[PDB]
Automatic annotation (TrEMBL), chains A, B:
The gene is carC. GO terms for molecular function: hydrolase activity. It comes from the Bacteria. Residues 24-244 form the AB hydrolase-1 domain. It comes from Janthinobacterium sp. (strain J3). This is Meta cleavage compound hydrolase. The keyword Hydrolase applies. Keywords: Hydrolase. It holds the Pfam family Abhydrolase_1.
Length: 258, 258
């Protein structure tokens, strides 16, 4: 369905999944212990790959991407994504699709380095303040908590995510990542920064998202001038996982216009 | 691109436009003098017809549909749509897509006769209270007023709508239609009625709609349990006219899941 590749992104070896041909679209997974490209985009990649060159990148400190001994700041993740894009073989601009932390990082690149970006998709994206014990069972509770009441847990998916979350190197980077966020009072941008997003944007949001309230989407829609909104019912914090076909199609439709 | 047809809908001769094959989708135009199927859906029909049997129906008292000497109530338009659906040759349920008044009418049928409906699309739809001098120039001002600042007026489209609005029989029915609405304090339903919509619904809304504020969409999304939301930037009260490709694709995507 896709192949695993590695590239040196400005000094940080980076792992990505690739499938398809055509215009390049980068998928950025969310935060959380054990979160990475395969578990986040498994069922979405095939669909998107029918029309675009899909590139699912593991963020700095996550999955199989490098985990150097550094301070894991949001600024560092933004720079990493910037370096990955440059390091990749792209003839022009690329579209960026991100969930939660991945969304905040795509948003950051869309403001600091928009000349590299064609379109942005924010899905249950972090960025607005609006307002795990590392056990297999703890992972089950987490997934159920972040998804809609109708989401059916898949052991295989749970085991895969748990395996990534347990890897001591991955866990160490995760702890450092959460520490910085914790010390800032959360992962966010001032609304003024968000108002700087000028590329066409699609704000995707689950109506039942407990992490990022639906009102957050309405605020993103008010702040980002060229933003479209896609609100999904019976959907939690992970639209791409809870309703892959729905999310993939909405994304294809958005990208087809842009 | 489509053919014009007529059918007896429970006593009311009704005019519709048809194109395509497959699952049936009914398009319902908005209110306003001279509003009818061709002017409202011209550029959308071809796109939708590539995947469905598209049926654009003129509401009771509008376009080429019959204009009997009766009291033009919202109840009467709902009954008419019900009769048209029954009078048509449909093997099963049908999807309904409506703008403003057409949306309110589709919504009404979706509550009173949902066994006939598979999906509903409300576009700048009337229904929530949330909160023309009949000259060619008056028509130009109206279109500019109801559309986004970037909408380019098309004389041909203006002349066509003006021609329908001037037809004395059409004008007489329009006056009666507006009179009833005026005497009720507007065209609306109690939020409790709207909460009865149980079919999958797509609430489409222009961010710059001056007739139906964007907040209205957020309220529809709160009231209708199985509703998805699609918010469009730089879009006024007529998404299907201002951005036909965008609207048609969003509709195709929605219907493909349902």
């Amino acid at each position: 369905a896709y192949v695993e590749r590695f590239v040196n992104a400005g000094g940080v070896e980076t792992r990505y999944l690739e499938a398809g041909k055509g215009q390049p679209v980068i998928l950025i997974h969310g935060g959380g212990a054990g979160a990475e490209s395969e578990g986040n985009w498994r069922n979405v990649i095939p669909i998107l790959a029918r029309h675009y060159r899909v590139i699912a990148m593991d963020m700095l400190g996550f999955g199989k991407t490098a985990k150097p001994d550094i301070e894991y700041t949001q600024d560092r993740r933004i720079r990493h994504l910037h370096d990955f894009i440059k390091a990749m073989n792209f003839d022009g601009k690329v579209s960026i699709v991100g969930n939660s932390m991945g969304g905040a990082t795509g948003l950051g690149v869309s403001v600091l380095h928009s000349e590299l970006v064609n379109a942005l998709v924010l899905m249950g994206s972090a960025g607005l303040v609006v307002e795990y014990d590392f056990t297999r069972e703890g992972m089950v509770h987490l997934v159920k908590a972040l998804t809609n009441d109708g989401f059916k847990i898949d052991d295989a998916m749970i085991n895969s995510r748990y395996t990534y979350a347990t890897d001591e190197a991955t866990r160490k980077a995760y702890v450092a990542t959460m520490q910085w966020i914790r010390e800032q009072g959360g992962l966010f941008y001032d609304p003024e920064f968000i108002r700087k997003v000028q590329v066409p944007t699609l704000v995707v949001q689950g109506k039942d998202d407990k992490v990022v309230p639906v009102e957050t989407a309405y605020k993103f829609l008010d702040l980002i001038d060229d933003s479209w909104g896609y609100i999904i019912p019976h959907c939690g914090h992970w639209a791409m996982i809870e309703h892959p076909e729905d999310f993939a199609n909405a994304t294809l439709s958005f990208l087809s216009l842009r």
